[PDB]
């Protein structure tokens, strides 16, 4: 018995959701700047992709913590 | 060209763009529908008497036909717009009083000091058909009434679109109207089944037939527009709950203002009835001024968006 | 006693909701920049659509975690 | 007689509400840009409507999660 | 008495409130752009009203799921 | 005749009304700012500005509807 | 009972406070625009007052919800 | 019955605090515009003061609700 | 029992904290405008300080509520 | 009881934290305007410092309330 | 025994919110200072003082945290 | 095991999620400025990448705290 | 007896996460200004890096308090 598994799931969901929220907050302005640079030049595509996909490490670490919690679940 | 009963609502119709010719005139729909659920929303016979007094002042201006100038809104309506507004206001306040009869709680919960109308605990007084503040029957009944009005308008608009497509050889719009009607009938059947009832096998066949009609209409007009539009039409069906929600809000405002007034008068003074009534009237006037604009906008908003975007315009 | 199942549902809902919120936060500015670019040039549609569809990975990860939690119980 | 169903409904409410919030956050800026483009040219209504209908996937996935939890109810 | 009734009420209230919040967030920006277009051209009323009334599907879905929960009450 | 469930129902309806009013205010902020700007500019945009301001009230209206349904369950 | 009484108090406090927050959010932008318009023209005072006093309906609704809850007490 | 009194206190504190927060949110922009207009014109002090003191009705109603809960306490 | 004192402490802390947050939100923009005005003209100091100190009534009301709660406990 | 002291600590910590957050929100814009004025002219130092240190009364009130609560402990 | 855990919760919440408020302050203050530095290389000290001034809120939060840990 | 284990998971998830959120908030503006600088010069790749990768220390400390909690539990 | 270890974990996670969020909020604008100054001059990198790494003391204090709580575990 007890609220063990449920609170573990709550923590897992909080980790994934807030990591994704931070990733989206970064990617908003980064993608806006990338779209502006692509409209200006159309040769900054690789740099824009690198800078946009770089903050995905936040949700990657969130998924790592999620998988750890799921394994201990 | 309209009958003289529908002539003032020509203002409301022609405030927007003109019809695209060879199209039915949605003008007589407004006198049928707008004052009905306006009265359903208000239901406050005292507020209706206030509206009648305002209409009498506007008729005095009609006798004083020289223009009414309000520099606060820069409004100039010398004979005709003010006459049409007087006609609309009287035609509307009639159904306001009529629905206030069912909404029998008069000028708020005035039954506390001397009960004219009667709750079902008091059969000796005059009865009230819909208990207003009770929630067991009234909420479901008025929600279903609003849903029924929405369904009636949806069926009328889609049938009108189909008939216009038939007459104008606009067969794509005819198929869209037929498929939307069938799909929304199926969605309504599904909602009625999910509300909780047995014998769902007979509603299952109706839902399947509606979905098949909608699928045929998608096969005709398949180009990326159909199913988000039918979702928005289902939302438009659901949007008619406003005519109950705003009415409940108005009833709660009036009832709690009368409760505060009777708390001032009966429970503390026993002789400050006039003072409590003055305070309640001041609060009622403030609430009336703040809420009347939205309460009159929401029905005509429902018409202008829901019926007119489907029908044409 | 035990309330694990409903609390697992709470965690799953938090995960998907916050992932959707982060994706919407990104897509707001990204879509505004994309609409501006496609209004200017009418040919930046590929880059604009790629930059708009890229932040949906947050919702994808949130739905993955939600599916894992649902399969747990 | 358990209060598990209430927590399941809480999770449903969280998922639907946060997904709708994210969709609204996206649609705010996207609709502003679309209305500006419509006022400027009016020939890009198709792209303006497409970029606004695109973020509906967030609330769609929220509805899917709520349907799953309501089936679990 | 069951606490599940009150918790389902809490979840329903959360769903309705956050869906209304999302629709308000969308309609702020969209209505500002629409009022600007109206003051500019006086003939953009159809497109402005369509774009303003379109993001109400979020609160529509929220109220649908709220009514589902109230039915399960 | 309920216990803590009645209080939780009250909490839910309060949350619904409060967040619906918050969303309505968030919409009305920008919409009213644009409307007041248009009034100061032209003084003839009163009908359009007032309509656009009063349209987002449906959110708090439906939140009040849901709270009234919850009070029905109360 | 008392626990229901306290939770009803919490609910009505939340309703009144969040309605006040929403009206403050509206009145901030509306009052800024109105003060600017009056400082420019000094004849827009009535329109500014109307546009500022209109948002008070949300506070009124929250107060009446709180008064209904207090009547339940 | 201690939890009854405590939750009443929590509700009244939430009410007064969020009412004060809404008033502050309004008064921020209203006071900024008022100070700008006073520095510009030096004669519109009264209008700015009226517009600044007007949105305190929210904290007035919050105080009323708090005092009602205090009388219940 | 001790729940009354604990939750009344929580309530009064919430009251003062949110009142202070609202006053800070107001004073941010108000003080920025005042600093700009006194940097420009350096004779608007009295009105700038009056407008800056004016929104402290909200934290005064919060302190009033917290002092009432402290006297109650 | 076994929960009174902990909840008192929660209340006083929340009071101090939210008061600090509010005065920080104020000091952000106030200090930005102050540094902008100092860069223009260094003779504004006394008034800028007064305007910056003036919203410290918020955290002063929060600390006073927390000390009063700690006196109960 | 839950008093210890709730004391820890209050301590962490106090210092976290104080740090959040000071981050909010130092964001705009440091942005203005860095913008001013370009000509204000002479006036670097004023910008540094203006940035380091909001640290008093972390000081107060740490004082409250130390008091709560002493009660812990 | 039991309540303590689940609450440990909740705190772990809160730590990693909020650290990721803070890093996303920083990386939004930093990456936008970096992409602008790259579009201008393209010789600023080292400085832009360094300034973008410095906020990752927040997630590093959050993961450190999460691993500490995992080892403790 | 346990049951408080998880709460201490929650408090430690809250402290670390909120300190990280505050430092992210600071470093966003500070690093944006630093990248702008770097793209301007490429010589004030020392001042830019000092001002960027300076607010990290908040995370340092949060980590110290988290270490204290971990020792308390």
Task: Give the DSSP letter string of G10-48.
Answer: HHHHHHHHHHHHHHHHHHHHHHHHHHHHHHHHSS-HHHH
Find chain L residues with C-beta within 8 A of A28's C-beta: 28
CATH of the domain at F7: 1.20.20.10
Q: In whole angstroms, what is the distance from residue J29 CA to residue I52 CA? A: 13
Angle at which helices A4-40 and L3-40 pack, to 10 degrees? Answer: 0
D22 in contact with chain E, both atoms CB, cutoff 8 A: yes
Please check whether residue B265 is in contact with residue B62, taking contact to mean a CB–CB distance below 8 angstroms.
no
Taking alpha carbons only, the member of H4, H11, J72, H9 closest to residue I8 is H9
User: Which F residues in the span 32-51 are in contact with B, Cβ-Cβ below 8 Å?
Assistant: 43-44, 46, 50-51
Strands in chain J per DSSP E: none
**Of M11, M16, M42, which is closest to L62 when you measure between CB atoms?**
M16
CA distance H70 to I65: 9
Q: Which residues contact B30 (CB under 8 A, 6 or more apart)?
A: B6, B9, B12, B13, B300, B303
Give B88's contacts (C-beta < 8 A, 6+ positions apart): B8, B9, B11, B12
Hey, CA dihedral for C50, C55, C61, C67, is it positive or negative?
negative
Considering only the C-alpha atoms of chain K, give the largest distance between any 2 of them, rounded to a whole number of Å.
58
User: What six digits make up the tokens of L39?
Assistant: 């579009």
Domain total in chain F: 1
B136 touches chain F (CB under 8 A): yes
F33: exposed, middle or buried (Cβ count in 10 Å: 0-12, 13-18, 19+): buried
DSSP M25-68: HHHHHHHHHHHHHHHHHSSTHHHHHHHHHGGGHHHHHHHHHHHH
CA distance F19 to B122: 39
Partners of L7 on chain M (C-beta within 8 Å) are: 5-7, 9-10
Beta bridge partners of B69: B76
Contact between J55 and J23 (Cβ < 8 Å): yes
Which residues 6+ apart lie within 8 Å of H4 measured at CB? Answer: G1, G2, G3, G5, G6
If one counts every other C-beta atom within 10 angstroms of the C-beta of residue C41, the result is: 12
d(CA E29, CA C21): 17
Q: For residue C56, give both structure tokens.
A: 């949906």
Ranges of H-type helices in B29-127? 29-42, 45-63, 80-102
Distance CA K45, CA F22 (A): 44
Give the N- to C-terminal CA distance of chain H in Å, as an integer: 11
| C-alpha angle C22-C26-C32 in degrees, rounded to nearest 5 | 145
The answer to whether residues C13 and D15 touch, using CB atoms and an 8 Å cutoff, is: yes
Q: Any idea which residue has 């100038």 for tokens?
A: B69
Please state, in angstroms and as integers, the Cα–Cα distance from residue B234 to each residue in B30, B149, B151, H64, following that order.
22, 13, 10, 42
**3-state SS class at D55:** coil
CA-nearest residue to J60 within chain I is I20
Residues E27, F56 contacting (CB under 8 angstroms): yes
Burial (0-12, 13-18, 19+ Cβ within 10 Å), B85: middle
**Euclidean distance between CA atoms B225 and K12, whole angstroms:** 53
Give the nearest partner residue to G17 out of H19, H36, H37, using CB atoms: H19
Contacts of K66 (CB under 8 A, 6+ apart): none
B75-76 and B69-70: which strand pairing? Answer: antiparallel
Closest CA to H35 of I23, G32, G51: G32
Residues of B in contact with E62 (CB under 8 A): none
How distant, in Å, are the alpha carbons of A38, C17, I28, J54 from that of K48?
Answer: 38, 41, 20, 19
Rounded (10°) angle between helices G56-72 and H57-72: 10
Cα dihedral sign for M32, M36, M37, M43? positive
* Cβ-contact G31, G52 below 8 angstroms: yes
Contact: J51, I52; criterion CB under 8 Å: yes
List, as one string, the DSSP characters of B217-254: HHHHS-SS-HHHHHHHHHHHHHGGGHHHHHHHHHHHHH
CA B256/CA B44 separation, integer angstroms: 14
Q: Which residues of B55-73 are buried (b: 16+ CB within 10 A; e: fewer)?
A: beebeebeeeeeebeeeeb
Residue D14 vs residues A6, B300, D3, E69, G21: alpha-carbon distances, Å: 16, 34, 17, 13, 21
CA atoms of B220 and B218, how far apart (whole Å) = 5
Long-range contacts, E30-33 (Cβ 8 Å, 24+): E30/D27, E30/D28, E30/D31, E30/D32, E30/D35, E30/E55, E31/F27, E31/F30, E31/F31, E31/F34, E31/F52, E31/F55, E31/F56, E32/D32, E32/F30, E32/F31, E32/F33, E32/F34, E33/D31, E33/D32, E33/D35, E33/D36
Residues G7 and F11: beta-carbon distance below 8 Å:
yes
Contact pairs from chain J to chain K, CB under 8 Å: 152
Backbone region of residue J53 per phi and psi (left: phi > 0; alpha: psi in -120 to 50; beta: other values): alpha
Backbone angles phi, psi at E44, to 5 degrees: -90, 20
Q: Among partner residues A2, A29, A51, which is closest to L3 by beta-carbon distance? A: A2
E strands present in B72-220: 75-76, 117-118, 126-127
M43-60: b or e for each residue (b if 16 or more CB lie within 10 Å)? ebeebbbebbebbbbbbe
DSSP annotation of B271 reads S
D and M interact (at least 3 Cβ pairs within 8 A) = no
Neighbours of F60 (CB within 10 A): 31
Q: Does B231 touch chain E (CB under 8 A)?
A: yes
Where chain I is discontinuous (C–N > 2.5 Å), the residues before each break are none
Kindly determine whether residue B256 and residue G60, on different chains, have CB atoms separated by under 8 Å: no
Q: What does the block give as tokens for K37?
A: 């530095």
Q: Hey, are the CB atoms on K5 and M4 less than 8 Å from each other?
A: yes
In chain B, the residue whose alpha carbon lies closest to the alpha carbon of E53 is B305
CA distance linking residue A9 with residue A3, whole number of Å: 10
In whole angstroms, give the CA distance from residue H48 to residue H32. Answer: 10
CB-based contact B257:B211 (threshold 8 Å) = no
Closest CA to L16 of G10, M16, K71: M16
- Which residues have C-beta within 8 Å of that of residue B196, sequence separation ≥ 6? E71
Min Cα–Cα distance to chain F from B72, Å: 9
Spatial CA neighbour of B129 closest among B108, B158, B100, B107: B100
User: What is the sign, positive or negative, of the torsion defined by CA atoms of M49, M52, M54, M60?
Assistant: negative
Angle between helices L3-40 and A45-53 (to 10 degrees): 160
Q: What number of C-beta contacts closer than 8 Å exist between B and F?
A: 43
Find, among D33, A70, F6, the residue nearest to C27 by Cα.
D33
Q: Is H13 exposed, middle or buried (0-12, 13-18, 19+ CB in 10 A)?
A: buried
I50 sits in which H/E element:
helix I45-53
Collapsed DSSP state (helix, strand, coil) of residue B126:
strand
Residue partners of M17: CB distance under 8 A and separation at least 6: K16, L14, L15, L16, L17, L18, L19, L21, L22, L62
CA distance C1 to H28: 50
CA distance D34 to G68: 43
Per-residue CA distances from B160 to B23, B26, B188, B305, M17 (Å): 10, 10, 20, 16, 60
Other chains touching D, judged by 3 or more CB pairs under 8 Å: C, E
Neighbours of G5 (CB within 10 A): 22
| Burial profile K19-50: b = 16 or more Cβ within 10 angstroms, e = fewer | bbbbbbbbbbbbbbbbbbbeebeebeebbbeb
Tell me, yes or no, whether chains D and H touch by having 3 or more C-beta pairs under 8 A: no
Q: How many residues does chain K have?
A: 72
CA distance H48 to H41: 11
- How determined? cryo-EM
Distance from the Cα of D64 to chain E's closest Cα (Å) equals 11
Give the residue numbers spanning the domain of G8. 1-73
Min Cα distance G25 → chain F (Å) is 6
- Output the six-digit token pair for B166: 């038939």
Total residue count of chain A as it appears in this document: 73
Give B199→chain F minimum CA distance, Å: 27
| Strands B75-76 vs B117-118: parallel, antiparallel or unpaired | unpaired
> Residue A48: which residues within 8 A CB-CB, separation 6 or more?
A31, A33, A34, A35, A37, A38, C51, L35
Torsions phi, psi for L22 (to 5 deg): -65, -40
Which residues on chain D are in Cβ contact (under 8 Å) with C1? Answer: 2
What are the tokens at D22?
Answer: 């994210």
Torsion region of B223: left, alpha or beta (phi above 0 gives left; psi -120 to 50 gives alpha): beta
Task: Provide the shortest C-alpha distance from residue M49 to chain K (in Å).
Answer: 10
Please answer whether residues F70 and F26 qualify as being in contact, where contact means their C-beta atoms are separated by less than 8 angstroms: no
Distance CA E4, CA D72 (A): 15
> At B17, phi and psi to the nearest 5?
-70, 155
Strand B126-127, strand B117-118: pairing:
parallel
Nearest CA in chain B to G46: B72
Q: Dihedral of the CA atoms K41, K45, K47, K50 (nearest 10)?
A: 180
Report the residue numbers after which chain A has a gap, meaning the C atom sits over 2.5 angstroms from the next written residue's N, or none. none
Residue I13 contacts J where some CB pair is shorter than 8 Å: yes
Neighbours of B194 (CB within 10 A): 13
Per DSSP, the residues of E8-70 read: HHHHHHHHHHHHHHHHHHHHHHHHHHHHHHHHHHS--HHHHHHHHHGGGHHHHHHHHHHHHHH
Angle between helices D56-72 and E57-72 (to 10 degrees): 10
- M48/H45 Cα distance (integer angstroms): 42
The vertex-K30 CA angle with K25 and K35, nearest 5°, equals 140
Q: Give the separation between CA M20 and CA M57, rounded to whole angstroms.
A: 10
Distance from CA of E66 to the nearest CA of B (A): 12
Please choose, from the candidates D5, K35, G43, the residue with its C-alpha nearest in 3D space to the C-alpha of residue J37.
K35
- DSSP conformational letter for B303: I
J15 neighbors J65 (Cβ within 8 angstroms): yes
CA distance F16 to F13: 5
Query: What SS3 state is found at B118?
Result: strand
DSSP 8-state secondary structure symbol assigned to residue A55 = G
Distance between CA atoms of residues B95 and C8, nearest Å: 52
Three-state DSSP at B123 gives: coil
- Helix (H) or strand (E) holding B70, with range, is strand B69-70
| Separation between Cα atoms, residue K13 and residue M15, nearest integer Å | 6
The answer, for L49 touching chain M at a CB cutoff of 8 Å, is no
Tokens found for residue K4: 């210890």
Structural contact between residues C23 and D22, judged by C-beta atoms closer than 8 angstroms: yes
What is the Cα–Cα distance from M12 to M63, expressed in whole angstroms? 9
Q: Residue K31: which of M72, L26, L18, D28 has the closest Cα? A: L26
Contact E18 D18 (CB under 8 A): yes
Q: Rounded to an integer, what distance in angstroms lies between the CA atom of residue A44 and that of residue C51?
A: 13
First to last CA, chain A: 14
SS3 B127: strand
H65 in G contact zone (CB under 8 Å): yes
Chain centroid, CA A52 distance in Å: 11
- Two tokens, residue J63: 């600390």
Tokens 């219940």 belong to which residue? H72
SS3 A41: coil
Residue K44: name the closest of K60, K57, K33 by CA. K33
Comparing CB atoms, the residue among B136, B139, B294 nearest residue F68 is B139
Q: DSSP string spanning B8-34?
A: THHHHHHTSPPP-SSS---TTHHHHHH
Q: What is the DSSP letter of J43?
A: G
Give which of B127, K64, F38, E5 is closest to D4, Cα–Cα: E5
Alpha-carbon distance B99 to B35, whole Å? 10
Residue with token string 């855990």: K5
M65–K11: do the CB atoms touch at under 8 Å? Answer: yes
Task: Flag whether residue B256 sits within 8 Å of chain G, measured between CB atoms.
Answer: yes
- Distance, CA of D42 to CA of J36 (rounded, Å): 43
- Can you name the residues that pair with D54 across neighbouring β-strands? none
Residue L10: partners with Cβ closer than 8 Å, 6 or more residues away: A7, A10, A11, A14, M6, M9, M10, M13
Distance of residue G54 Cα from the nearest chain B Cα, in angstroms: 6
Tokens 């004052």 belong to which residue? Answer: B35
Cα M32 off chain centre by: 17
Token pair recorded at residue I6: 């604990």
Q: Chains near K, with 3+ CB pairs < 8 A?
A: J, M
CA distance L35 to L58: 22
């Amino acid at each position: 018995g007890g609220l063990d598994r449920g609170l573990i799931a709550v923590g897992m969901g909080l980790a994934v959701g807030l990591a994704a929220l931070g990733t989206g907050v970064a990617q908003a302005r980064i993608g806006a700047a990338g779209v502006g640079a692509i409209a200006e030049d159309r040769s900054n595509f690789g740099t824009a992709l690198i800078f946009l996909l770089l903050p995905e490490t936040l949700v990657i670490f969130g998924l790592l913590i999620a998988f750890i919690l799921n394994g201990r679940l | 060209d309209n009958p003289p009963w529908a002539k003032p609502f020509e203002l409301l119709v022609s405030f927007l763009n003109t019809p695209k010719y060879g199209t039915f005139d949605p003008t007589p729909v407004v006198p049928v529908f707008f004052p009905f659920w306006f009265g359903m929303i208000v239901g406050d016979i005292g507020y209706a008497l206030l509206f009648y007094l305002v209409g009498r002042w506007l008729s005095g201006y009609v006798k004083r036909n020289e223009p009414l100038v309000i520099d606060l809104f820069a409004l100039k309506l010398k004979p005709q717009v003010i006459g049409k507004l007087v006609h609309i206001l009287n035609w509307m306040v009639f159904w306001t009083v009529v629905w206030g009869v069912i909404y029998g709680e008069f000028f708020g919960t005035f039954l506390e000091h001397l009960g004219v109308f009667g709750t079902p605990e008091h059969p000796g007084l005059i009865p009230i058909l819909i208990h207003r503040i009770d929630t067991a029957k009234t909420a479901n009944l008025l929600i279903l009434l609003s849903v029924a009005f929405g369904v009636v308008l949806v069926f009328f608009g889609l049938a009108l679109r189909a008939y216009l497509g038939l007459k104008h050889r606009h067969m794509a719009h005819f198929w869209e109207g037929v498929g939307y009607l069938g799909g929304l009938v199926g969605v309504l059947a599904l909602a009625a089944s999910y509300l909780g009832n047995l014998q769902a096998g007979w509603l299952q066949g109706l839902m399947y037939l509606g979905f098949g009609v909608f699928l045929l209409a998608v096969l005709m007009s398949r180009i990326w527009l159909m199913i988000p539009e039918i979702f928005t039409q289902a939302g438009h069906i659901l949007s008619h709950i406003r005519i109950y929600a705003v009415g409940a809000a108005g009833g709660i405002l009036a009832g709690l203002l009368t409760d505060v007034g009777f708390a001032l008068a009966e429970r503390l003074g026993l002789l400050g009835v006039l003072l409590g009534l003055l305070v309640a009237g001041v609060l009622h006037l403030l609430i009336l001024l703040l809420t009347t604009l939205g309460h009159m906008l929401q029905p005509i908003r429902l018409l202008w968006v829901e019926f007119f975007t489907k029908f044409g315009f």
